[PDB]
Amino acid sequence: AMDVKCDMEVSCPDGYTCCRLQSGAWGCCPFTQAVCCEDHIHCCPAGFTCDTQKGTCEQKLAAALEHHHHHH
């Protein structure tokens, strides 16, 4: 249960993912897939998309932005 850790206040071992949130702490996602992104199971409290092509959930954007110019 202490195999993996994101900080000195969380405990997310194997099968878990470390995702930062606004709750002034980290989050443990017990799954294996697009962390803090896409549908299914997001480590984000919904309403947030993954940015930085890493998986940062922060409001609707485009999910995994690889381009520069865009018109929506």
UniProtKB/Swiss-Prot annotation:
Disulfide bonds join 6-18, 12-28, 19-36, 29-43, 37-50, 44-57. Promotes proliferation of the epithelial cell line A431 in culture. This is Granulin-4. The gene is GRN. The chain holds residues 281 to 337 of 593 of the full protein.
